[PDB]
Design an enzyme around this catalytic site. Structure first.
Site, PDB file in Angstrom:
ATOM      1  CB  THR A 124      -0.943   0.052   1.208  1.00 26.70           C
ATOM      2  OG1 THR A 124      -0.171   0.038   2.419  1.00 26.70           O
ATOM      3  CG2 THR A 124      -1.929  -1.115   1.179  1.00 26.70           C
ATOM      4  CB  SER A 158       5.840   0.316 -23.370  1.00 27.57           C
ATOM      5  OG  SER A 158       5.367   0.772 -24.623  1.00 27.57           O
ATOM      6  CG  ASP A 212       5.926  -5.153 -27.651  1.00 24.01           C
ATOM      7  OD1 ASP A 212       7.006  -4.813 -28.189  1.00 24.01           O
ATOM      8  OD2 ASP A 212       5.381  -4.495 -26.728  1.00 24.01           O
ATOM      9  CG  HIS A 229       9.080  -2.265 -26.669  1.00 23.00           C
ATOM     10  ND1 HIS A 229       7.754  -2.580 -26.886  1.00 23.00           N
ATOM     11  CD2 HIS A 229       9.083  -1.127 -25.933  1.00 23.00           C
ATOM     12  CE1 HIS A 229       6.987  -1.686 -26.283  1.00 23.00           C
ATOM     13  NE2 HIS A 229       7.769  -0.791 -25.703  1.00 23.00           N
ATOM     14  CG  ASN A 243       5.424   6.575 -23.493  1.00 19.33           C
ATOM     15  OD1 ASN A 243       4.657   6.138 -22.621  1.00 19.33           O
ATOM     16  ND2 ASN A 243       6.308   5.797 -24.129  1.00 19.33           N
ATOM     17  N   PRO A 253     -12.998   2.688 -25.049  1.00 19.87           N
ATOM     18  CG  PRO A 253     -14.849   4.083 -25.042  1.00 19.87           C
ATOM     19  CD  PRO A 253     -13.924   3.364 -25.974  1.00 19.87           C
TER      20      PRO A 253
END
Length: 279
Positions: free
Chosen positions: A16, A224, A39, A69, A161, A175
């Site tokens: 937490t 990412s 990817d 990546h 980004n 959405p």
């Protein structure tokens, strides 16, 4: 189970408060779930995947991750040392070339591929897809992500980004999928992270250590990097039976650390992915 001296992001999603160094988690570790990493590919040979990673589709002359990546992203999903869901099955779909780029028509095809290919796979605890990619707004790209979600896959996508409202990016702006912003180790919004009402959740995104190609590791930053934290967490929760593909994004929002992040603009959720593991 507990992982000593874990990457800060893993410690973060089982605490937490920021600043801890152990990742606490249920030993089921996402066993029986599957996460598709859409990817640049995955270096399935990497020892950190322990045989649990395999390429299933490529859109280029090779299925190899010549970039890193996708291997990094897959590592945050499910590698033994750097992964949220340490026993999940990882499937690689190479829609990005070795420069990290890809056409929207190819990304859409990869998404439609996953919707069908999951019917070829033993994933009794459910299926997740992690999309650390995006570009400008496309209705077609948004629809593809919505179809993948509708077919019974928990879709997690990067917010982007651009330090901008993610409403102008796809599939971030769709959405019905889970759009993921990035935070840093001090619970600040990552300086690059997009924001806005379309975001559902934040995950660790600044200075994330994970796998890299050539059997190595490195730390890099991005939404990412936050997206696979949430994708792996979903697979972990679906293995625990606590949620389903259709509801996991909402469940993760339901159970997130609330109000802990700074520099959250007005109208953006202040929610940070959290596994609420109690030993």
């Amino acid at each position: 189970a507990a992982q000593t001296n874990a990457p800060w992001g893993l410690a973060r999603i089982s605490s937490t408060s920021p600043g801890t160094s152990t990742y606490y988690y249920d030993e089921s570790a996402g066993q029986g779930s599957c996460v598709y990493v859409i990817d640049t590919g995955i270096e399935a040979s990497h020892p950190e995947f322990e045989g649990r990673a395999q390429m299933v589709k490529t859109y280029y002359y090779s299925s190899r991750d010549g970039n890193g990546h996708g291997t990094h992203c897959a590592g945050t999903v499910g590698s033994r040392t750097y992964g949220v869901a340490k026993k999940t099955q990882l499937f690689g779909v190479k829609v990005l070339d070795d420069n990290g780029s890809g056409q929207y028509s190819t990304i859409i095809a990869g998404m439609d591929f996953v919707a069908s290919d999951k019917n070829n796979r033993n994933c009794p605890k459910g299926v997740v897809a992690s999309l650390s990619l995006g570009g400008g707004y496309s209705s077609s790209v948004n629809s593809a992500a919505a179809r993948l979600q509708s077919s019974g896959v928990m879709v997690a996508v990067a917010a982007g980004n651009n330090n901008a409202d993610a409403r102008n990016y796809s599939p971030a702006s769709e959405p019905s999928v889970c759009t993921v912003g990035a935070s840093d180790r001090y619970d600040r919004r990552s300086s690059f992270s997009n924001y806005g009402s379309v975001l559902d959740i934040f995950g660790p995104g600044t200075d994330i250590l994970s796998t890299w190609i050539g059997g190595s590791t490195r730390s890099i930053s991005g939404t990412s990097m936050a997206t696979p934290h949430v994708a792996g967490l979903a697979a972990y929760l679906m293995t625990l039976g606590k949620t389903t593909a259709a509801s996991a994004c909402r469940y993760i929002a339901d159970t997130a650390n609330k109000g802990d992040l700074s520099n959250i603009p007005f109208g953006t959720v202040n929610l940070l992915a959290y596994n609420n593991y109690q030993a």
